[PDB]
């Protein structure tokens, strides 16, 4: 036992006055957890990351260093936050840019690159007037109803970031009202850290705590979902050492018009009165990403879809001593129960011990006079004994009109059967329902004729078994390969799950799964490049393997715009940059693949001459040149001269164009002068070699590995060196008799190029293409310029954008110089366009030699192309119709379609719209969209015939269609009237099937329908609508197998605590149409058949959604746990008083062992173990926190033994409980 | 829009700011002396606009 033995600003780490031009202040330090162990508390997603407050103190300290006192920092903004390792290298620099103006940024170099994290201005000393003060007592009076600080800590922790312990303060959050725009809090550093106040202007923990005060907001529901992070503040005004800082005051400027965005609050601090030590202005707090990104994440996590899991029979043969009874309830078919008889034989025989299985058959209902027979035979008397099985036959059925009519009455007879079983009071064994190809299953074998009559049986099964937790129903799907013997073996036990299936010779299980949108599932179309607009693109930056084809759509020739079908295209060096996402994307140009093209004119504009349709033409264009059809300006393109083939033109021009430009216009080669080319093996290098050889000048060159240097000798150029090295310059010096070079073309960076300038002699000319060095601002030392140098940077794209005429003249010039043969093509290393990934590798990895060329097969072909997000959603040339559009969601859809300027909009209200709906429709009609109303009942087939004929008779083809019917009741199965069944089914089915058969010829770009979220389980009462909803999903599968697009969406409001959410926020939600409108727009561009757009994990509906069905794919908790008020005391008082002694004795022993760091004996004194006054204080404070008993040393002295102390505490608890 | 051509003899922040003032493809010609011998740490970043640099001395050219 011994001591461990373990002035500079901590975060800055060191200061240096780099007093060059411009003058720069530089700081270098470390902020890892090894030094700042306290900083480890600030962790988001259990990952230690410093808050943005850390930069603010860094900026304040830097400004104080450079600006002296009265320092201030303006418009600080945060980049991506820093992940705190044990040690982390952090660097900050402040530089003078204008007289009296200094800009300051921070960054962290890593693995040869760097990432900036905060930028701010250091202009300060604006005024001498101290900021005015204000009455703290008046604010405190005006702000009652303060919220406990630890509650805010829990709120932040559950939102993703836990603050640990070192981030104390913010004891209470005082507010004026429920809509108060200003709050204040009492803030102070923890005792363990309070000593650190002498090393900061503002302690980072205290500042972050002040930021945490914003979490109170106008309401506790401010930014109800997700976590917010600060993005910096407009201005920061430090005016006093916060050594004595006690309270902080805020002003929520209510920039959160949505209640979530920005915040833009102002923070002040004070002490005991209207002191103002630090002022914070315009805090970008309610932030984190774009609202579009927020909605994308919300719809990603708010969408659900059932999932099917293959597995062996889980509980096969585990049942024993049962007595089954199989009843066929589908004997309207001639022989449905023949397969069920084997199930009875397997159940009766394979079952161990005296296991048996009776067999029965019956029509589903046949006639009303033969009702209640099932109840008497099984449901009331012969059940109870272990085993009940219900079979509906191996029937398959083409969903025609006859099948639809049969299925409606079939589900009616289903509810008739189930009603009697529900009404029975006795216990019922778990049911075994048998159906063939009717359960909703994975797209595997999700074809045609899938017996939709039997498809809707799911929706009611978990309504009867929700009021009766017993008889837990399990769905099984039958097929020819299901091997019914195994099924009955599974039926012999009945494993606890709801849905099972058989799409091959193996067993399946089904449960709900989260539904994030996939990318390979996107809409496709078999397109012909001969006439269909097609383009290539990358799915995500940084992954070249994600190259994919996308329908580029036809592009008619605009004003003065030419249209060209590509014959060939090349690969620019910038392509790999955009391919890997490291392209200089700052300019927000969103570049694509291809700056160059060659081909034949497809179409001609009106403001264009010279060029004409059919001309051989090549040129440069943006928007990506790797597309079948392209429309751009004529001046960007030049007619190919005769003899000059497109193949040679595309592979030679661009590199030759750049080289000739640099060597003829920027520099001017004088025959015999000395020029050097970096990486001559490159296409541009070969082009420059050709230009120089044409110009008859002395040539030096360099390249990579000796293989890349071999062809250089093969083309017969001397002075060949290794580009990867830097010693080439002095080698040239001695190889040029000490005299330097005249012109130099560089593709290198860093020390390589600066040596190049050092090699330049007198009137040297320097031309650079390297994107990296110029964009990195790693400025070259300009001392060698004294020789009289000229520096040029070249970007053909920039000139093309700004001076199309000049680049056009250059292209014509190089075309002529290639036609006459004075210029040689670099290489003909062609590669397939569809396999451009390996070309990207070859250029990026540079393992290849020479110029890489393409091959463009997509002149005319046939393949499936993934449609983009540009896919048609609104069309002037399109008719649209909605059923139930008078509903709020339908009203929003109509409003957005009219605002979008769609062609025609038809509506149906199942007899006629209500007067208010008619008034809203006529008000919206002034927008010009053809809004028309169709009468009749969707349940009537001729009404749908009208919807396909007369609605189309408005004058446009019908493309967008949707159905939006719904039920308005949640009564249990016993109360269901046939009127409700008819109104739920007949409109739905007579819309779906009739519009499917009656709209085949129409373009029909999309088709969607509404659904209920509980359709997988049924509402506690509603079973009929759930059954109806769990019928369209298979119908969607059936229609997709047919081919036409179809989709379905379940609808659910924002009931995270039920109805109380809306009453707490706005009282009225109409099932969240605003976010649904976004999803509806996305869902139009989606082909997924069915999905549940329902909130999850937040609603009380989660509890039943995870226990009603014993299945689970998402954990029903986020790991956040609450703490009971005096946890041990309540559970202790639950026990009888005699137990209390030992029960609290165990806790006393644990606490004493924690304090003393050693084991103890309850009957022995703490003093003999080493307890002291500090230990006594610790133990009594813990006791107060747990049992709230004022333990005092004289009590401790009398009860120095843990047993006696526990007995005294038990007696005290008994006395106070008696009181 | 900025300027197209700059003939500069100033030093330090003056030329630095003026160099930014150049428009796309601008021409910068330098005639002063202090900066070139001072190895001034200017900013290579604005060269994105396709700038061109020229250091001038009649004596050396002669």
Residue numbers in the entry:
A (entry chain A): 876 to 881, 894 to 2106
B (entry chain B): 1626 to 1687
Direct quotes from the study:
We obtained a density map with 3.87 Å resolution from samples of the ACPs = KSs ( = indicates crosslink) dual crosslinked protein, complex A, including all domains KS, AT, DH, ΨKR, ER, KR, and ACP. Both ACPs are crosslinked at the homodimeric KS domains, linking Ser2060 in ACP with Cys177 in KS with the C16 acyl tail bound within the canonical KS substrate pocket. The crosslinkers tethered on the ACPA and ACPB through a 4’-phosphopantetheine (PPant) arm are well resolved within the KS • KS’ binding tunnels, each making a covalent linkage at the active site Cys residues (Cys177 in KS and KS’). The full MAS structure adopts a homodimeric architecture, comprising two catalytic chambers (chambers 1 and 2). The dimerization interface is comprised of the KS • KS’ (2566 Å2), DHA • DHB (429 Å2), and ERA • ERB (1165 Å2) domains. Supported by partial density, a 14 residue flexible KR-ACP linker (L5) allows the ACP to travel between the domains of each of the catalytic chambers of MAS. Due to the flexibility offered by the linker-based architecture, complex A is not perfectly symmetrical. Distances between the active site residues Tyr1912 (KR) and Ser623 (AT), as well as Tyr1912 (KR) and Ser2060 (ACP), are 78.1 Å and 71.9 Å, respectively, in protomer 1, compared with 72.4 Å and 69.6 Å inter-residue distances in protomer 2, revealing a significant in-plane tilting movement of the modifying compartment that pivots at the KS • KS’ core. The AT domain in complex A is in the apo form (without substrate in the active site), consisting of an α/β-hydrolase and ferredoxin subdomains, sharing a similar fold with other type I and type II systems. The absence of observed “turnstile closed” conformations in MAS complexes A and B implies that iterative type I PKSs utilize a different mechanism to prevent premature reloading of the KS domain.
As exemplified by isoniazid, which targets the enoylreductase in mycolic acid biosynthesis, mycocerosic acid synthase (MAS) offers a potential drug target by producing part of phthiocerol dimycocerosate (PDIM), a key component of the cell envelope. MAS, a fully reducing iterative type I polyketide synthase (PKS), is composed of six domains that together catalyze the elongation of n-C6-C20 fatty acids to prepare mycocerosic acid. Using a combination of dual covalent crosslinking and cryo-EM analyses, we elucidate the structure of mycocerosic acid synthase from Mycobacterium tuberculosis trapped in two distinct catalytic states during its iterative cycle. These structures reveal domain architecture of the acyl carrier protein mediating condensation and dehydration through dual site-selective crosslinking of the acyl carrier protein with the ketosynthase and dehydratase domains.
